[PDB]
């Protein structure tokens, strides 16, 4: 029985910065150099720098 | 040249495009074939080209 299934877990799936890549969770550090993030939504976004 | 690899003629292109030209490797997370090439440029619209 499936019905039993409540909910499934499935990840987080985003973009570098045009391609798209899949994880379990919000928050990735994968970008390497020194940089952190973390998500909160499906969306498109833009972020700085400086 | 046909037995270079990625890595040396990722520095030369950066000469050939002067740097005007703004590339980098990224992935699908596509296991076996990893790399994708993105190229990018600026202005309002899609005649960044």
């Given at each position: 029985d499936?019905?039993?299934?409540?909910q499934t877990?499935?990840?987080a799936?985003?973009?570098?910065?045009?391609?798209?890549?899949?994880?379990?969770?919000?928050?990735?550090?994968?970008?390497?150099?020194?940089?952190?993030?973390?998500?909160?939504?499906?969306?498109?976004?833009?972020?700085?720098?400086? | 040249?046909?037995?270079?690899?990625?890595?040396?003629?990722?520095?030369?292109i950066?000469?050939?495009?002067?740097?005007?030209?703004?590339?980098?490797?990224?992935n699908?997370?596509?296991?076996?074939?990893?790399?994708?090439?993105?190229?990018?440029?600026?202005?309002?619209?899609?005649?960044?080209?």
């Open positions: 499936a019905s039993l299934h409540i877990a499935q990840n799936e985003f973009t570098l910065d045009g391609i798209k890549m899949f994880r379990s969770s919000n928050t990735v550090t994968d970008l390497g150099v020194g940089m952190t993030l973390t998500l909160n939504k499906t969306g498109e976004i833009n972020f700085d720098v400086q | 040249d046909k037995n270079t690899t990625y890595r040396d003629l990722a520095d030369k950066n000469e050939a495009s002067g740097g005007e030209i703004v590339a980098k490797i990224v699908t997370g596509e296991k076996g074939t990893p790399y994708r090439l993105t190229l990018t440029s600026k202005e309002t619209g899609e005649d960044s080209a």
